[PDB]
Amino acid sequence: RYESQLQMVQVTGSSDNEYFYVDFREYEYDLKWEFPRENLEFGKVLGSGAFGKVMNATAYGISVSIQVAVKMLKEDSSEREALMSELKMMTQLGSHENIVNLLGACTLSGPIYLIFEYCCYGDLLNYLRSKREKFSNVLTFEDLLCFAYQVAKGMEFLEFKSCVHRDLAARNVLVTHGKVVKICDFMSDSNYVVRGNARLPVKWMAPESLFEGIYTIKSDVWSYGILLWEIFSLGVNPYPGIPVDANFYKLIQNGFKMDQPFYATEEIYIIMQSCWAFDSRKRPSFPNLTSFLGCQLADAE
Ligand SMILES: CCc1nc(C(N)=O)c(Nc2ccc(N3CCC(N4CCN(C)CC4)CC3)c(OC)c2)nc1NC1CCOCC1
């Protein structure tokens, strides 16, 4: 069964487990987002999962013509409804510079299309990896700091909107013009562990997610720490050379944290470590993180 990894939550109490997920299934879709099918000229496939795909297209008159990314299902009615819920969620969220924003949708006369902003340089993980020889076209320490700042800003927006990202990682951040980055939502991949219905990004998950299935904004701070390690290693797999097995679960339970990656300063590393506090209440907030990285970045000589 399909589900979006960006989820709205409502808090029902002060403890981490006191919340529920907001289902938009019973809410009505605002028809001002509806865009004509025939104004999409489909180009190439950008990625496929089991339940769907993201395709490049030219969109005529959506903003004049622009590139877009179009999310769609593969050729059930439950899958259709989940995509509508995601659409309804994204219509209500509002836009932000550091989110992959919804531009429109095609829902009435054919298969469901969700039309998003196109991010011409693809995912941040592959971007970082392609720049390893070209680190001083050229990638710098300041660019890495800027990417970190932008992701934190994106997450601060999601915190403010009462949302959680259940899969924050460099693979789910995209890169567009001007070194702008944007947080996106969405078997062969060894970073996800199969466990019944679930596909778990184990090495990105906070303990309370691993052990109790709890996802809060503070779980996202942990994942953000992992993503920082990805940035400042130029896209190394977290916990490099450590397999995902029952020993991994024990390592995390006992307070195992990664070392300082090569491109991190000591100050960036202290921030990473704070994100990995076992107790969620000791982790910094996203407004804290934007302040710390903004101050680090503001040291551009
Ligand atoms: C909603 C998920 C998603 N949204 C977008 C989006 N809204 O725009 C998106 N775009 C995207 C854009 C461009 C590329 N390319 C092609 C050119 C290539 N070249 C290499 C050679 N070099 C010299 C010049 C650049 C760099 C990668 C791309 O990767 C194929 C994806 N992709 C999304 N999902 C995928 C799932 C599979 O994994 C990555 C993310």
Numbering used by the authors: 571 to 633, 637 to 648, 651 to 710, 762, 781 to 830, 837 to 951
What's written in the study?
Fms-like tyrosine kinase 3 (FLT3) is a member of the class III family of receptor tyrosine kinases expressed on early hematopoietic stem and progenitor cells, and plays an important role in hematopoiesis. Wild-type FLT3 (FLT3wt) is activated by FLT3 ligand (FL), which promotes receptor dimerization, auto-phosphorylation, and cell proliferation via activation of its downstream signaling molecules, including STAT5, ERK1/2, and AKT. FLT3 is made up of 5 functional domains: an immunoglobulin-like extracellular domain, a transmembrane domain, a juxtamembrane domain (JMD), a tyrosine kinase domain (TKD), and a small C-terminal domain. Mutations at the JMD or TKD of FLT3 induce constitutive kinase activation that is independent of FL, and occurs in approximately one-third of acute myeloid leukemia (AML) patients.
Gilteritinib is a selective FLT3 inhibitor that inhibits both FLT3-ITD and FLT3-TKD mutations, and is classified as an ATP-competitive type I inhibitor. To reveal the binding mode, we determined the crystal structure of the FLT3 kinase domain in complex with gilteritinib. As expected from the computational modeling performed in our previous report, gilteritinib bound to the ATP pocket of FLT3. While the JMD was clearly observed in the overall structure, a portion of the activation loop including Gly831 in the DFG motif was disordered. Asp829 and Phe830 in the DFG motif adopted the “DFG-out” conformation. In the binding mode of gilteritinib, two hydrogen bonds were formed between the carbamoyl group and the main chain atoms of Glu692 and Cys694. There was no distinct interaction between gilteritinib and the activation loop including Asp829 and Phe830. The crystal structure of the complex formed between FLT3 and gilteritinib was obtained using the kinase domain of FLT3wt, including the JMD, which has been reported to bind to the active site of FLT3 and to stabilize the autoinhibited form. In the complex structure with gilteritinib, the JMD bound to the active site, indicating that FLT3 adopted the autoinhibited form. Gilteritinib was far from the active conformation of the activation loop, suggesting that it likely binds to the active form of FLT3 as well as the autoinhibited form.
